[model samples]
Target: NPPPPETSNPNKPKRTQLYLLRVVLLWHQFAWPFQQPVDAVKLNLPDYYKIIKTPMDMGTIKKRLENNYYWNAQECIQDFNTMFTNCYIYNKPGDDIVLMAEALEKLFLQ
Candidate 1:
C-alpha cells in the first residue's frame, strides 16, 4: 500500500509564513535602494518625482501659480516648461508641481 498523499491546507501556519515571506521580500526589494547611501545632490532633485508620476493638468498649474509663491500664470508656466528641459526634477506629476517649486526654492533661493 502507498503512503497518504500530502494535502494542501490554506488555514495552516504555513499560509501565514508564506504571506509574511512575500511581504518581507517585496519590502526588501523596494526599500534597499533608499537605504543605500548616495550622492545627496544627485538624489535630492528626483526624489520628489518618484512619489508622483502623473502628468500635470491645467488646474494644478493654475493652483501652483495662485498660491504661496504667487507667481504670475504665464511666468509660472514658462518657468515650469523651462524647468523640465533644464532640470530633470520637474518631471513629477502636475499635482506635485507645488512640491517641486518649493524644493527648488529651498535649494536655490535660500
Candidate 2:
C-alpha cells in the first residue's frame, strides 16, 4: 500500500484556524444556538449521554479545530452534520432547538 501523505507539509491543502472560527461564529452570531454542549446537569436530564450517544456541539468542534481533528474540510463538515443531526434526534420535531438546527444547517450550506 502507498504510504499516507504528510500533514506537516504546507504544500497540501488544509483547513485554517480562521476558516474554522468564522464558520463556528456564523451559527453563534445567527442565534448562538450551538455555543456549548448539552450538559445534563443544568437541564437536570442526566440521561443526556444515554440519549445523545453520538453527541457533538460547536464547542466540541471548536476544540477539535484546536486539537486538529478537523484536518480536512470534509472532517469539519462531518462534525457539523453530527452536531446538527444530534439536535433533531434528541429534541422533538416541534421544538425550537430542533428548529434552530434546521435553520443553522442551511447556514452551513451557504
Candidate 3:
C-alpha cells in the first residue's frame, strides 16, 4: 500500500499556505492578469479533497449531496417524485440545473 497522507508536511509547508501559493502560481499562468479559465480537473486530488472539506456558509454541500442522492436516483418512483418537486433546481433555463450543465458540456465539447 501507499504511504499515509500527511496533514502537514514539516519539510514542506502548511496545507493552507500551500493552497494559497498554488492559487498565486495558477494566477500567474494567464496572459491577462484577471482572465482565468474555469477548471474542471486540474485539482491535485488531495487539494480537491481539502477544498470540499473547507467550511462555507449554508447549503453548499446539502445541494451537492442532494443532487447525487435525490436527483440522480435510478429508481423510477423517486425519479418521478423528483421531477415533480424540482426543489433541487433553481435559476436559468431548461426547467432544470442538470440540463443546463449538460448543455454547457455540449457547448464546451464543441
Q: Which stretches in model 3 have alpha-carbon errors above 4 Å?
A: 1-95
Q: Give the higher-lDDT candidate: 2 or 3.
A: 2
Give the winner by lDDT: 1 or 2. Answer: 2
Using Cα atoms with residue i matched to residue i, what is each candidate's TM-score against the true structure?
A: 0.21, 0.70, 0.17
- Distance (Å) between predicted and true CA of 110, model 1? 33
Clashes of 3: 0
Give the top-scoring candidate (lDDT).
2
lDDT of 3 by residue, 1-110 (tens): 12222222235321112221122211122212112221224523333223332212112222223233222223322322332223223223555444533443333233
Ranked candidates (TM-score, high to low)? 2, 1, 3
Candidate 2: list runs displaced more than 4 Å.
Answer: 1-20, 28-30
lDDT of every predicted structure (CA atoms): 0.33, 0.66, 0.27
TM-score of 1: 0.21
Per-residue error at 55 for model 1, in Å? 19
